[PDB]
Structure 1
Amino acid sequence: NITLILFLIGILGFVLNRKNIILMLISIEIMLLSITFLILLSSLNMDDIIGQTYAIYIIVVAGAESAIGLGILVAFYRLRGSIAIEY
């Protein structure tokens, strides 16, 4: 239930935000944690170590994609000098 509310918070990050692109990166991190938390709790209910394994690979991949996204942001910011959307 908490995991569902957290997914909304990550969803709501995209609704409320017109100009903060950094918040877009953070809202993906919230969504991914919410989905991993749901898998972890379900894996506990169904006594299944595969759920924990799936969550570990989501942490690995979401950590890997955070680094790519920050690198892409750095290449973007090197040329623009701002992460602000003019709106």
Structure 2
Amino acid sequence: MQLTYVLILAALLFCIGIYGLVTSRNAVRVLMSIELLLNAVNLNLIGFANYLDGQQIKGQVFAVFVITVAAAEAAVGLAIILAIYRNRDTVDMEKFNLLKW
């Protein structure tokens, strides 16, 4: 296990969440794909901290704050899902296109 195999794993996890960002039709699967992106930048970061400058781990501190923001981006994000669902009684990303042009 080298540094290179971690970043390819993080880059592959980035493009799986990228594919889930554009192809998902349920609004909650889009938020679940956002957590795939924010764990891609954490898997990229601890691998950057384990192999580069591991004495003073500055990536693992920075990997903590991404976990905290994505915890607050999902709590804010799911309150947005529950706000649309009370008015528009579906969760369907092909049905929210009323602010088109």
Tell me if both proteins adopt one fold, taking TM over 0.5 as the criterion.
Answer: yes
- The RMSD of aligned alpha carbons is 1.6
Structure 1, unpaired ranges of 5+:
none
TM-score (norm 2): 0.77
* Distance in 2 of aligned mates of 1:74 and 1:42: 37
The list of structure 1 runs, each at least 4 consecutive aligned residues, that deviate by more than 3 angstroms after superposition, is none
SS in 1 for 2:90: coil
Q: In structure 2, what is the equivalent of residue 27 of structure 1?
A: 33
* Amino acid in the other structure paired with 1:49: I
* Distance in 2 of aligned mates of 1:80 and 1:56: 36
Of 74, 77, 80, the match for 2:85: 77
Q: In structure 2, what is the equivalent of residue 6 of structure 1?
A: 13
More helix by share: 1
* Distance in 2 of aligned mates of 1:70 and 1:26: 10
* Distance in 1 of aligned mates of 2:37 and 2:90: 26
Number of residue pairs matched?
86
